[PDB]
């Protein structure tokens, strides 16, 4: 029979036993899935950043298109117009259309406008009141009011079955949802930070990723393999004395597009450090890439040979100039 028939049979067998537990888990999943979706501004930021990265990658792959005469090749205008029409709020559609669709620009103005829009949206998102009440993400607060007054069968904190244990007697149960929700913007995305209290006073933090990537299962498989490998390291002598372990957060999919990830609140990316230094020193974060693109365009428009095999000394000189400047 089709796989979904067997899946439904297993689900029915599961529901016949533990009806109240299944009901509680289903209600919790439904509430999280319904009230933790992206607002329009974050969608706009995500899509603008994706378009800018794609344009930079294309120009890098095929230089000489960065000149002021190439008229937006690769049939990307279809993507531009589709994004303007069916993925943009009515409020900002006119300005976006006037800036992008009407002008029909070259690559230079394309990237310039994308950069301006990205900066605008970054500034807009960074000035939000970050800690938002948990009772706002609801119509009658089925998350702050639920759970110790609305649950049925003592749900467990998710993600505890991915570990290499021998019994579940001492698993931590959900006791409460903390009433504050953080707003976090990453380099190209953003999410909400939930927090849970266990029945022993411990606190666990998760990130809710609504537009989960297209390759989540592969990453989960890699994490599974290296979580398996951590046991041998824990049991071997040359490694256990140095305390060598891979760092692998727990991930639990709720829907084929939603996912919760165990969170560390003190993370920072290397890109963030670079951008903070640029901000403090009055520089521009985008200067090196524009410099590289312009120099490669100039040196490839002319002869692109006379260097030994592929280590074009022009590339090394550009790299040294970037390092020095």
């Amino acid at each position: 029979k089709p796989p979904w028939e067997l899946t439904e049979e297993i689900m029915s067998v599961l529901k016949t036993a533990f009806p109240l537990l299944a009901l509680s888990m289903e209600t919790m999943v439904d509430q999280i899935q319904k009230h933790f979706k992206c607002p329009p501004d974050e969608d706009a930021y995500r899509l603008i950043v994706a378009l800018l990265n794609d344009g930079l990658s294309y120009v890098s792959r095929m230089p000489a298109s960065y000149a002021k005469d190439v008229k937006l090749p690769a049939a990307t205008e279809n993507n531009i117009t589709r994004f303007a029409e069916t993925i943009l709020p009515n409020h900002i559609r006119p300005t976006f259309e006037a800036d992008f669709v009407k002008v029909k620009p070259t690559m230079y103005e394309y990237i310039h406008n994308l950069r301006k829009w990205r900066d605008k949206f970054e500034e807009k998102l960074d000035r939000r009141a970050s800690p938002a009440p948990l009772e706002s993400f609801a119509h009658y607060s089925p998350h702050l009011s639920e759970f110790r007054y609305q649950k049925f069968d003592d749900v467990e904190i998710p993600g505890q079955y991915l570990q290499h244990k021998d019994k579940n007697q001492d698993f931590i149960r959900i006791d409460r949802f903390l009433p504050n929700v953080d707003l976090v913007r990453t380099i190209g995305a953003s999410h909400r930070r939930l927090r849970i209290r266990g029945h022993d006073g411990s606190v666990h933090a998760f990130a809710v990723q609504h537009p989960a990537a297209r390759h989540c299962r592969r990453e989960e498989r890699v994490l599974q393999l290296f979580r398996q490998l951590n046991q041998t390291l824990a049991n071997k002598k040359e490694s256990r004395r140095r305390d060598l372990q891979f760092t692998l957060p727990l991930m639990v999919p709720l829907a084929p597009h939603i996912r919760i990830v165990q969170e560390d609140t003190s993370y920072i990316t290397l890109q963030s450090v670079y951008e903070d230094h640029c901000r403090r020193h009055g520089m521009n974060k985008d200067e090196p890439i524009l410099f590289t693109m312009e120099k490669l365009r100039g040196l490839m428009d002319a002869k692109a040979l006379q260097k030994p095999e592929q280590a074009v000394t022009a590339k090394l000189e550009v790299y040294r100039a970037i390092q020095e400047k």
Binding site: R221, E238, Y274, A311, L316, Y319
Partner: protein
């Protein structure tokens, strides 16, 4: 994975990411004393019996192969022999990479010389300048 053939390939100028800024954050003394030795320690502890790593990697490689074949939309046979052969080949490649790092030299050379060679290759500016702009070889 290579889009043409079912193999594990990187095809980048450097073996891994080790740029000048990370090197400066670590420092020369720490880079020599901790970073270089830990890689060999992990390799030695994981490849002690050589039949453990392959057994651990079998299912992961099988799933990767199934995904590749399904995405290429060119299975057309579900041939078990082909699956077995490809899985064995890929597991052998990965175990070769792991066993290279855990091997000591023959003469009077230091225990971790392959790791030092790899670090030299990854810090050479000649091939650090052939990376893409989004990779930011600087920093």
């Amino acid at each position: 994975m290579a889009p043409s053939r079912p193999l594990f390939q990187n095809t980048e100028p450097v073996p891994f990411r080790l740029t000048p800024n990370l090197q400066t954050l670590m420092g020369p003394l720490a880079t020599e004393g901790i970073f270089a030795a830990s890689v060999m320690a992990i390799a030695r502890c994981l490849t002690e019996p050589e039949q453990h790593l392959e057994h651990a990697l079998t299912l992961f490689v099988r799933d990767e192969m199934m995904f590749w074949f399904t995405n290429s939309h060119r299975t057309m046979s579900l041939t078990e022999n082909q699956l077995r052969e490809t899985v064995q080949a890929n597991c052998d490649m990965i175990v070769k990479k792991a066993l290279a790092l855990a091997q000591t030299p023959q003469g009077n050379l230091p225990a971790h010389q392959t790791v030092t060679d790899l670090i030299a290759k990854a810090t050479n500016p000649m091939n650090l300048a052939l990376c893409d702009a989004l990779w930011m070889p600087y920093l």
